[PDB]
Design a protein around this motif. Sequence first.
Motif, PDB file in Angstrom:
ATOM      1  N   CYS A 157       1.317  -1.649   0.078  1.00 36.82           N
ATOM      2  CA  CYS A 157      -0.238  -0.278  -0.098  1.00 36.82           C
ATOM      3  C   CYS A 157       1.081   1.180  -0.135  1.00 36.82           C
ATOM      4  N   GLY A 158       2.197   1.375   0.344  1.00 36.48           N
ATOM      5  CA  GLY A 158       3.078   2.450   0.334  1.00 36.48           C
ATOM      6  C   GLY A 158       3.443   2.446  -0.733  1.00 36.48           C
ATOM      7  N   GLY A 159       3.956   1.058  -1.250  1.00 40.38           N
ATOM      8  CA  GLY A 159       4.612   1.676  -2.819  1.00 40.38           C
ATOM      9  C   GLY A 159       3.365   2.266  -3.079  1.00 40.38           C
ATOM     10  N   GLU A 160       2.650   1.812  -3.157  1.00 38.88           N
ATOM     11  CA  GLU A 160       1.071   2.082  -4.565  1.00 38.88           C
ATOM     12  C   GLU A 160       0.473   3.375  -3.960  1.00 38.88           C
ATOM     13  N   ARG A 161       0.715   3.667  -3.089  1.00 40.72           N
ATOM     14  CA  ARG A 161       0.797   5.252  -2.770  1.00 40.72           C
ATOM     15  C   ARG A 161       1.538   6.111  -3.449  1.00 40.72           C
ATOM     16  N   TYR A 162       3.178   5.633  -3.578  1.00 39.64           N
ATOM     17  CA  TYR A 162       3.532   5.985  -4.132  1.00 39.64           C
ATOM     18  C   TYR A 162       3.637   5.792  -5.593  1.00 39.64           C
ATOM     19  N   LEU A 163       4.835   6.248  -6.338  1.00 40.43           N
ATOM     20  CA  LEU A 163       4.657   5.749  -7.945  1.00 40.43           C
ATOM     21  C   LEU A 163       3.691   6.474  -9.162  1.00 40.43           C
ATOM     22  N   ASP A 164       2.684   6.608  -8.007  1.00 39.06           N
ATOM     23  CA  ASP A 164       1.514   7.551  -9.307  1.00 39.06           C
ATOM     24  C   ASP A 164       2.089   8.132  -9.416  1.00 39.06           C
ATOM     25  N   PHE A 165       2.874   9.416  -8.399  1.00 37.99           N
ATOM     26  CA  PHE A 165       3.876  10.364  -8.280  1.00 37.99           C
ATOM     27  C   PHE A 165       4.800  10.521  -9.855  1.00 37.99           C
ATOM     28  N   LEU A 166       5.557   9.398  -9.828  1.00 37.90           N
ATOM     29  CA  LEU A 166       6.914   9.136 -10.042  1.00 37.90           C
ATOM     30  C   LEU A 166       5.917   8.294 -12.301  1.00 37.90           C
ATOM     31  N   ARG A 167       4.768   8.177 -11.611  1.00 36.54           N
ATOM     32  CA  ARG A 167       3.647   8.230 -13.278  1.00 36.54           C
ATOM     33  C   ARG A 167       3.853   9.210 -13.587  1.00 36.54           C
ATOM     34  N   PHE A 168       2.509   9.974 -13.039  1.00 34.67           N
ATOM     35  CA  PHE A 168       2.831  11.332 -13.019  1.00 34.67           C
ATOM     36  C   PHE A 168       4.093  12.064 -13.572  1.00 34.67           C
ATOM     37  N   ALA A 169       5.428  11.890 -13.306  1.00 35.85           N
ATOM     38  CA  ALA A 169       5.895  12.373 -13.864  1.00 35.85           C
ATOM     39  C   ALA A 169       6.195  12.651 -15.564  1.00 35.85           C
ATOM     40  N   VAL A 170       5.800  10.910 -15.490  1.00 38.87           N
ATOM     41  CA  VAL A 170       5.785  10.687 -17.451  1.00 38.87           C
ATOM     42  C   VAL A 170       5.230  10.511 -17.696  1.00 38.87           C
ATOM     43  N   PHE A 171       3.484  10.536 -17.237  1.00 39.39           N
ATOM     44  CA  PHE A 171       2.701   9.806 -17.672  1.00 39.39           C
ATOM     45  C   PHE A 171       1.739  10.110 -19.748  1.00 39.39           C
ATOM     46  N   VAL A 172       1.330  11.879 -18.357  1.00 44.52           N
ATOM     47  CA  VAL A 172       0.694  11.862 -19.770  1.00 44.52           C
ATOM     48  C   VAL A 172       0.924  12.566 -21.032  1.00 44.52           C
ATOM     49  N   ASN A 173       2.275  13.395 -20.740  1.00 46.87           N
ATOM     50  CA  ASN A 173       3.451  13.697 -21.692  1.00 46.87           C
ATOM     51  C   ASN A 173       3.751  12.599 -22.449  1.00 46.87           C
ATOM     52  N   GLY A 174       3.348  12.186 -23.542  1.00 47.10           N
ATOM     53  CA  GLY A 174       2.964  10.733 -24.041  1.00 47.10           C
ATOM     54  C   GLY A 174       4.922  10.604 -24.862  1.00 47.10           C
ATOM     55  N   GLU A 175       4.863   9.536 -24.513  1.00 42.99           N
ATOM     56  CA  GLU A 175       6.791   8.872 -24.511  1.00 42.99           C
ATOM     57  C   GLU A 175       7.767   9.211 -23.850  1.00 42.99           C
ATOM     58  N   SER A 176       7.385   9.144 -22.892  1.00 39.94           N
ATOM     59  CA  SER A 176       8.479  10.722 -21.599  1.00 39.94           C
ATOM     60  C   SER A 176       9.998  10.201 -22.143  1.00 39.94           C
ATOM     61  N   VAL A 177      10.780  11.106 -21.626  1.00 37.12           N
ATOM     62  CA  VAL A 177      12.179  11.829 -22.134  1.00 37.12           C
ATOM     63  C   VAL A 177      12.788  10.483 -21.222  1.00 37.12           C
ATOM     64  N   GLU A 178      14.161  10.805 -21.456  1.00 37.21           N
ATOM     65  CA  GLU A 178      15.085  10.141 -21.020  1.00 37.21           C
ATOM     66  C   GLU A 178      16.390  10.293 -20.457  1.00 37.21           C
ATOM     67  N   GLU A 179      16.197  11.946 -19.665  1.00 34.62           N
ATOM     68  CA  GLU A 179      16.968  12.478 -19.082  1.00 34.62           C
ATOM     69  C   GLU A 179      16.751  11.799 -17.648  1.00 34.62           C
TER      70      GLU A 179
END
Lengths: 184, 49, 242, 49, 462
Positions: free
Chosen positions: B1-23
């Motif tokens: 539950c903690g890690g799932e509470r995490y990583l939607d942040f990191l998903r939202f780092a790269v999600f809607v901007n399609g095919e997000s960055v490499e840096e």
Amino acid sequence: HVLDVGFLPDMRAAASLDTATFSTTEMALALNRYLCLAVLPLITKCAPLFAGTEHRAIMVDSMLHTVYRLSRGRSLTKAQRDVIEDCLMALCRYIRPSMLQHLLRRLVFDVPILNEFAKMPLKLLTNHYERCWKYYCLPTGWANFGVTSEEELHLTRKLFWGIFDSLAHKKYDQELYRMAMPCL
Amino acid sequence: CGGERYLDFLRFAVFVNGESVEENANVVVRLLIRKPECFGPALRGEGGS
Amino acid sequence: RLQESISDFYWYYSGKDVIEEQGKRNFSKAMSVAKQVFNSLTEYIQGPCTGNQQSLAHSRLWDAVVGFLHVFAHMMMKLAQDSSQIELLKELLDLQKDMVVMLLSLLEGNVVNGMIARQMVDMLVESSSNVEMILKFFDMFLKLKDIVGSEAFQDYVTDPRGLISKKDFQKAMDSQKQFTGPEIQFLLSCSEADENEMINFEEFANRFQEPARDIGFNVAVLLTNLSEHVPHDPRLRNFLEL
Amino acid sequence: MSFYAALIDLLGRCAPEMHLIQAGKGEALRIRAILRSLVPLDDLVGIIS
Amino acid sequence: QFLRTDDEVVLQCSATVLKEQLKLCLAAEGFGNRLCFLEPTSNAQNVPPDLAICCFTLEQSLSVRALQEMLANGHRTLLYGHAILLRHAHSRMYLSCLTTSRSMTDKLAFDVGLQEDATGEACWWTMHPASKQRSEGEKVCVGDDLILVSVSSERYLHLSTASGELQVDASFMQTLWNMNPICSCCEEGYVTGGHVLRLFHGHMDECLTISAADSDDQRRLVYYEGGAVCTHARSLWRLEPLRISWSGSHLRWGQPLRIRHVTTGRYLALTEDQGLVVVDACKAHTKATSFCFRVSKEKLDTAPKRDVEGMGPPEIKYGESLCFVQHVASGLWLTYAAPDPKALRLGVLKKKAILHQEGHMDDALFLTRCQQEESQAARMIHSTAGLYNQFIKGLDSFSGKPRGSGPPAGPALPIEAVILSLQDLIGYFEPPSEELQHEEKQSKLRSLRNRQSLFQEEGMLS
């Protein structure tokens, strides 16, 4: 993958008045079929592709539970783009319109299906080595399209223009001699 | 539950901007593999997993 | 850390021949920073604080300055092939000027064998390839004013107006000696082509001969100080005859 | 399963590249190599099963 | 002080298993196995460890941006945060990370090996420091341990104490990796550890030897011989001091060491009374096997105990040294016994070298270094023979045993390594190209013709 999955689309057909809660699956796999749009392998019809095509047809027909018309357009493009992978194989999928859709004279949903069926005659020009009863029945499709759309169904512009197509690489003198066809 | 509470942040780092960055993704996956315990150690543990 | 970052900046663009404008723009401030730093380090010991000098000799300054020279030789060689970066070139020459000024004031007329010339010699021979590169740069490209008025350069000036072609410089400086075809093709790379009719070589020599004079005087001053204040090193003697 | 689902969804959205540069690059294919060395196939299809 | 470039380096690490620390070096043969393996070295006082395959060397220590530039198409000092290229000095194969699994880790297992990977994608390894007392940009020193990571796999060079025994890979996490200066820039016309040469008695043509193979005497019977084995494999014998680090220091007069025969990998000693017997590499406990040098066989007090760390003083010239040796235990000096009847004298000229109580005043072993590929050849002889004999013996395990549908034999069947070695030897002995210029073709066919002959002085056919 389609061999392993294909019963799950079959479960996706379960929608009359009963499921109503597993719609997250419906929109989930609405979003995981665009890969199938992106690809055109599988010519030889080895797998049961009649099953997958019937699943696609009944799923676009199934509006009794969650569809949410954007995914209707997505699934409809899924049905439409499959014509650039088949080799005139799925006789169950070519007769199922004859049993479901061509019987429907543009009622609600069969107008997109008529637009989708319009692609195969574009192959049939100088092609489509015919089947007996299918080539017997499709002139009946032409006839009801050219009588019912005239005078039984309404005479709207967009309605008649939805399937205003020929669908005939037809013969010269005759095509068939089936059981005696004086009148339906 | 903690890690799932995490990583939607990191998903939202790269999600809607399609095919997000490499840096961002390179440092992400590099720090992640450098600490394999951040994976499920049931999956990516130090041994049989 | 600063010059280490600058060398990492160099190796990026080293694949390229032309540099982006904002990259050059950042390079300007990065060089100005080190210019201020070199002026500072001069003003510590310009006026000889000897404990400072002995601490400096046992420092890691040597690695920094050799890395500076290594980036400088390749960068100025690449930079000099186009008009639009000679600003950056002369700013790098100004940085080299301040660096050699620091190297001079480190001595302040030192003793014969106070380990300062020795460590200088060690970093010099360790920096041999890039030393040769910059020395080749100067000993080649000073001569854009040497050959002004030369008879065997004016032999092939096929222009009454004097706005001569490119290939006059090609023919009249390989036919004539004290040059080299790499310098020829590089110079006409640096020259304004204008469809190979005009050079305006007066301005071409006027822009280029100025800062090289100052820096060559300072580095020759360094070399003469180092030769006189210590003989008996033939690696030095190689660098002298070079 | 939600945690691992968000993990693989991130890693899919943390793809090493797309069809732009996987043609014209190896470094992103290095990231792909590290990825595939970590996770195999034949279990994701098991997850479909 | 620090590892300058184009130097000879060896790895070293530590790993306690039995509640006792154990120094684990690393090595790899090359031919017959692209994989590497570990090397315990703690037991030097009672057994010599193999000290050729572990030795690697340096080519270039650069920035990773410089690496990315040279991928797209001098003498220095090693720095942290640098990529580094290693070269296996024996097999000339550069050391890389690979794409294979082992020990059932079910992961980025990546069983480390070496190959001809001069293409710089994976043979390079990124340097780091080992601790916060060091940091990036610091000039790296000798003896410090390090953390080292691949370029292509970007995984720590891993020492896997896996579910089985101890193992090495780049799979999981760190391991502290030391860099002993095994050797350095030696000097012209002098000797160091690892060298190999011919040991010429007399002035013109006479040298040490051993019994030719295919002999029931086991080749423990050292002799002398004239000018035939002076171009063969028998007369080449390796040395190594009893140290581990700086083993490639110059060894001086009276300097202790062991002597290995290159082909058999065996050592020399006097066990109880059996003369100069060629002892194997287990009963080699640095007293029977420890030997030194002597300018003459006169009595010197033997007080040369002065430890050295650097390159040290060079003295020994090849052809002018005229060395002698006393066994450190017994003191007795090498000389031919001069035992020979009229038949053996007129027959095969063959003495019997023996550590004589005083010796004769003509031993005087002037020297001719061999600086050639043929060292690599002789090591390939040793490795190949050691593989093929155990292979055929494993074949003979089940030869008179038609199995049933059950356990088919006893030990395992060495198959993959021998196949790799076989195709490697095929590529080794293969002819030159017809399209090449005449001169290089002649030199190369001469070289392989020599090597064809060198695979009969230790048999290699029968």
